[PDB]
Write a protein that binds this DNA or RNA. Structure first.
Ligand SMILES: [Mg+2]
Ligand SMILES: [Mg+2]
Ligand SMILES: [Mg+2]
Ligand SMILES: [Mg+2]
Ligand SMILES: [Mg+2]
Ligand SMILES: [Mg+2]
Ligand SMILES: [Mg+2]
Ligand SMILES: [Mg+2]
Ligand SMILES: [Mg+2]
Ligand SMILES: [Mg+2]
Ligand SMILES: [Mg+2]
Ligand SMILES: [Mg+2]
Ligand SMILES: [Mg+2]
Ligand SMILES: [Mg+2]
Lengths: 261, 133, 206
RNA sequence: UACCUGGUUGAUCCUGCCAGUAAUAUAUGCUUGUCUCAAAGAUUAAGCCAUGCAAGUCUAAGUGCACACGAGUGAAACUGCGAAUGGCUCAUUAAAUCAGUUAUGGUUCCUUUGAUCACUUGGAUAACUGUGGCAAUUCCAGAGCUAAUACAUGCGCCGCGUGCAUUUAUCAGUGGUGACUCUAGAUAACGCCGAUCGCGCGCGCGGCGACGGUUCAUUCGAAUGUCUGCCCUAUCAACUUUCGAUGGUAGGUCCGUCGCCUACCAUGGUGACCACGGGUGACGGGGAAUCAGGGUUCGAUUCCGGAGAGGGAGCCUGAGAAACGGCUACCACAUCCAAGGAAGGCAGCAGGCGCGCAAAUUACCCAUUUCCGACACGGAGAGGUAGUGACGAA
RNA sequence: UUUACUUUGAAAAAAUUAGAGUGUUCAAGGCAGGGCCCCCCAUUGAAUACCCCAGCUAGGAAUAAUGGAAUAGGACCCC
RNA sequence: CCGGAGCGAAAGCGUUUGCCAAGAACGUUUUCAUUAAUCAAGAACGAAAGUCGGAGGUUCGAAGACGAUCAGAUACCGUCG
RNA sequence: UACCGAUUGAGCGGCUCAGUGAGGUCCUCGGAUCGGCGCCGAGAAGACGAUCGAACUCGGUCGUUUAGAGGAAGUAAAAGUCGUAACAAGGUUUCCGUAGGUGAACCUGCGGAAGGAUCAUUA
RNA sequence: GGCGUGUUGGAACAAGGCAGAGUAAGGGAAGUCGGCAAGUCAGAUCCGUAACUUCGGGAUAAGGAUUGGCUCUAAGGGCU
RNA sequence: GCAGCCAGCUUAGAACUGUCGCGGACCAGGGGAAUCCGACUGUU
């Protein structure tokens, strides 16, 4: 309590990692970076558990110490990088281009090569701060700072920026009808279409998202991550966008596929 | 009167006049626009932000300067007996001099402000006269 | 040491609360300003976060402004005359915020004559002896004399304000916090705020 | 499984408790062939501790003449950063901690990410060589050299210009907010602009990296507030302020709000809906045991949060500590002295004494788990493994 | 006129518990694997419930309070 | 007379007459119009004995004396008070 | 086994009145000294004052733990002595409140109650 | 207003007296039948005051703090 | 509704100040816990 904490217990880790409780006591505390600790995935896990290309914690160090991984094209050396949402993880040595995207549930999936789409990403703007002499600023999703914004962009829209130039190419306005991937718990990964936006003066605003099969629900305004203009997304989605097969529905698919294999 | 010179920091005095800001559907009435008082803790004249919460209560005592005691009642549910118990928490709120007819039994709607005293963290924003004369 | 915490006070009900923990550093306190009047003595204080704070112990000059007009000239602070907090901040000559002082009027008149070209703080009967003051009453060009005419029509300051120009001591007020900012900035009283403190000075000096 | 049975009588039906019954958790008794898991000095003594260890750290990249080995890894050495985490214990603490809730428009930050941003002049100094003091310590003194990424150097006003950080006063209305005394603009004024390093070409050059500053970010997080919720006690009924108790004004103070403090004023605030006071074998919670339902009891205990490091108090440094495996005192306790002085905090890991009804090995190693630094290399009693183990479970 | 009450969703740490999924030889548990010579639980998993109270979010208007006009400063339209 | 009859919140209350201000029940197309019920804290009243201060002390009669009975009566019984 | 108890109690422990007050911070000063070179600079020891405040010497108060000559009860023993209070009309019906008295249970007065041995006693 | 110090002067300043309730280091009742003696305390203001009690008291209980000088501020009136 | 004028004597607060000294002389209760006796004041 005298300052910053530098350890993370395994049982205290976010559930989205699925760690073995009988191997160690501590979890890999993701190094400080652009994303929240609760909404990220340590680079060691994605290379040791998800991809299984590393067997221990010292072998994943040999991945970054040989300059093969590169988040957003920039090779990193910290094996505990946040690697949050929409973070393109390209591997030019192995030709693989991963994007850490959520499943129908809240987990980090192995979304493979998206070369023609991996060259950019999507970023949610937070605030519009005015600099000196009237120069506005925009804070993007993964702490990337973009200046000189268009006067039509607001504090809720999304933008696409190339990994090299880092300039705003296109933007998607926020209104009723835009494709979205809800984030913030109990809907993490549910992809749908925005339908309504309730206004609450002095507190959070409520928005309603309708999935593909009509699974309409409600969530806060701070939970919207617009991914497509209307109903068409920009980047490749994993197996099942927002269908969210129920326990009974998932049960039907598992028995019908194992009997054939 | 007082010992210092009562004045608003933002505006400039007469040379060779009131500032109000509440928002949130509790804008300044006609009594607090022109006004005859000056105080730094008034919801209109002073600098106070309605940012935290919105509550309600009934004023009980008016024996203080620019402050009154409200009574916020509620019922606490005891799970064992499946019943409730009558509880109440008194709060000291800052009363602006513009509000009148707040003697007793009046319903007071308050808003969470920055700490203005050791116990005062809410300011009156609405006065509703009871059924009387 | 000094602390501004709350767990050492009594509760709103009046009951004494026991301290949950010992004194912490993030709630420390430091001695009062007590900024006297003296030449250029300021100490630097390292504060929360590795920053710097300027402790003004004694200051003689003040960057005051004029209320009615638009004039901000640094002037020498002479003495304090009254303080609404307590008469102890004027018996010990401590420069704090919102205390009325008697500051010099030489920078104010130097700019008033160069802008309005009208004698204000001159003695009734005496004339301008030095040659440097006659240049403010000369004949100028056509483009120069035209602007001084529209400025002379609006120059009648209040009679309660022109009196202090005769003695060279203007009733100013320190509008900044010296102990924290390290600068005794402020402004000059005018209008109703000038009459209020003059009545308190008259009662205190009567 | 939503369960009862013995005992008042000569006998009977009742009230009613005792006893019987079954889990649970501590101890203990006797007994104990195998395997997989697993609690384990919390209870009385947050009692006291012999020895050892637990934070240091070097890359191709701030500074590199130990010749020990021979340009180059180099040991020492100066600079940078960590040591504020973890661990341990539950003493303190009863709207306090804590839990949900959430405010900072009432606050700041190391690392990380993304921004952005006067031809190198100056003199010492460590290691070391050399001369010494003290019985003694992680004590150092004197002199002589030798390094710095340590330290220091397109307009307003009226002839003719051209970066700024902050502090007050005044005027006007780019992007915002539910609401700014917001972010911007303008007026009068008032310690940030790179004297740094590596593997490496052509012929006055460029294309690859690090480190570091300035205000805005982000993030790991902190800190202080709103709403709601604590066991027992009235043989505690009124309580709080001739030292702030409640509120008002101004100011001081702090990162910031505030009786946080000072000064002038008001006589307030809380209270039978239990304040205040006292007690707790009280750290709070997530939870545990037992339960038809309703409940009862427990939660020192591996997670989270808080608290503390013999008792307090006061500080240094740092972005972050009122730090104690850092200091300065006093108190308690205690060690070595040559009697001049010096040096102490196992409620860290093992172990000892004491206390008890009550609780393990001075064991092996950084491989997993990860954490810290100049980092692929080095460090971790945090942790992992084994021994002891009839807590307990399969 | 606004509350109490009920329902829905986000929130209401993880572990634990309840509990879907998996033959750790079984079980306590674990979150991991049966089979075809680099594919195959359709780029092998994967869920959920509960989380009291309070606050927050979207309905209903039964019950029980409260309340709009009696010296009408009455509700509406005027002008 | 005086009763398993009345009244009062109870304790309690019965000779005549007079004075004084209450109370239930009933009567009612009166009146008021939910102004309630039960009630920690608080209070009135509360047989008798006892206590303090006066009057009066017939009878009775704590205490006490004495007479009887008994193994023993410091009692029942008796006189007296 | 607890209570009462002189002792003008007490080993034992918490917040505090009033004193005294180490230490640090801060402030007002001080200027040993070495870098310039006879003036601007850095600058230790040390000191006034303020502030935080351990701790100590005396008190107040609260909580808590204990010694005590002696005194007076309760319970458990054996039920030993005395008498018979109660349980049948318990041989004086019992019992309540109250008061007095008496070795002892008890007696008596006054007012009660039936839990009485009367649910009843005649115009 | 009264007076010459109370029925005399001068000079010395030994012992021992009487008085000044003189002072006294360190100790502080060890003195003595006995704190005899005089020592402490003392006025006023602001605080704080127990056991016990006939509720009146005990009580100035006990125990504390303050007190000068100077320069100001504030409040407490009358009259036309 | 006050302006003018007049009149004292106390009380509170603050600064400054001297050697921390200040009811500076004078005036002016030591206190506490108990026992015995007499109630007290008064009297001898
Ligand atoms: Mg003579
Ligand atoms: Mg004579
Ligand atoms: Mg003599
Ligand atoms: Mg003598
Ligand atoms: Mg004497
Ligand atoms: Mg003596
Ligand atoms: Mg003697
Ligand atoms: Mg003797
Ligand atoms: Mg004497
Ligand atoms: Mg006495
Ligand atoms: Mg006696
Ligand atoms: Mg006598
Ligand atoms: Mg007597
Ligand atoms: Mg007498």
């Amino acid at each position: 309590a005298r300052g910053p904490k530098k350890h993370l217990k395994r049982v205290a880790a976010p559930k989205h990692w699925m760690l073995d409780k009988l191997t160690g006591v501590f979890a890999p505390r993701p190094s400080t970076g652009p994303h929240k600790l609760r909404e990220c995935l340590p680079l060691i896990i994605f290379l040791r558990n998800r991809l299984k290309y590393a067997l221990t914690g010292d072998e994943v160090k040999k991945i970054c110490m040989q300059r093969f991984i590169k988040i957003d094209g920039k090779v990193r050396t910290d094996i505990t990088y946040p690697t949050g949402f929409m973070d393109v993880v390209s591997i030019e040595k192995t030709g693989e281009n991963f994007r850490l995207i959520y499943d129908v549930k809240g987990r980090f999936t192995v979304h493979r090569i998206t070369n023609e789409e991996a060259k950019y990403k999507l970023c949610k703007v937070r605030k519009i701060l005015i600099g000196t002499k009237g120069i506005p600023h925009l804070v993007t999703h993964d702490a990337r700072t973009i200046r000189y914004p268009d006067p039509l962009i607001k504090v809720n829209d999304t933008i696409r920026i190339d990994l090299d130039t880092g300039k705003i190419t296109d933007f998607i306005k926020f209104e009723t009808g835009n494709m979205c991937m809800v984030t913030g718990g109990a809907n993490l990964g549910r992809i749908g279409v925005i339908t309504n936006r309730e206004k609450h003066p002095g507190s959070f605003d409520v928005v309603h998202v309708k999935d593909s099969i009509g699974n309409s629900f409600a969530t806060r305004l701070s939970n919207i991550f617009v991914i497509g203009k209307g109903n068409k997304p920009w980047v490749s989605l994993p197996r099942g966008k927002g269908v969210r097969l129920t326990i009974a529905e998932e049960r039907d698919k598992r028995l019908a596929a194992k009997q054939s294999s | 009167n007082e010992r210092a010179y009562q004045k608003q920091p933002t505006i400039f005095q007469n040379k060779k006049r009131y500032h109000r800001n509440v928002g949130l559907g509790f804008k300044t009435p006609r009594e607090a626009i022109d006004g005859t008082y000056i105080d730094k803790k008034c919801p209109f004249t002073g600098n106070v932000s309605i940012r935290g919460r919105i509550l309600s209560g009934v004023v009980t005592k008016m024996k203080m300067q620019r402050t009154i005691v409200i009574r916020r009642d509620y019922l606490h549910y005891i799970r064992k007996y499946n019943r409730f118990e009558k509880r109440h928490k008194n709060m000291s709120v800052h009363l602006s001099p513009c509000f009148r007819d707040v003697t007793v039994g009046d319903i007071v709607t308050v808003g969470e402000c920055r700490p203005l005293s050791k116990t005062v963290r809410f300011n009156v924003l609405k006065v509703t006269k009871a059924a009387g004369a | 040491g000094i602390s501004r915490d709350n767990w050492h006070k009594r509760r709103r009900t009046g009951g004494k609360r026991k301290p949950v923990h010992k004194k912490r550093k993030y709630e420390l306190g430091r001695p009062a300003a007590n900024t006297k009047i003296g030449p250029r003595r300021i100490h630097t204080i390292r504060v929360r976060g590795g920053n710097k704070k300027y402790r003004a112990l004694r200051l003689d000059v003040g960057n005051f402004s004029w209320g009615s007009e638009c004039c901000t000239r640094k002037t020498r602070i002479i003495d304090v005359v009254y303080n609404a907090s307590n008469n102890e901040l004027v018996r010990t000559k401590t420069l704090v915020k919102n205390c009325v002082v008697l500051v010099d009027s030489t920078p104010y008149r130097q700019w008033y004559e160069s802008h309005y070209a009208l004698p204000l703080g001159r003695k009734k009967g005496a004339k301008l002896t030095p040659e440097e003051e006659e240049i403010l009453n000369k004949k100028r060009s056509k483009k120069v004399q035209k602007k001084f005419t529209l400025r002379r029509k609006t120059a009648k300051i209040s009679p309660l304000l022109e009196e202090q120009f005769l003695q060279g001591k203007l009733l100013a007020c320190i509008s900044s916090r010296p102990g924290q900012c390290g600068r005794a900035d402020g402004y000059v009283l005018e209008g109703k705020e000038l009459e209020f403190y003059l009545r308190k000075i008259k009662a205190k000096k009567g």
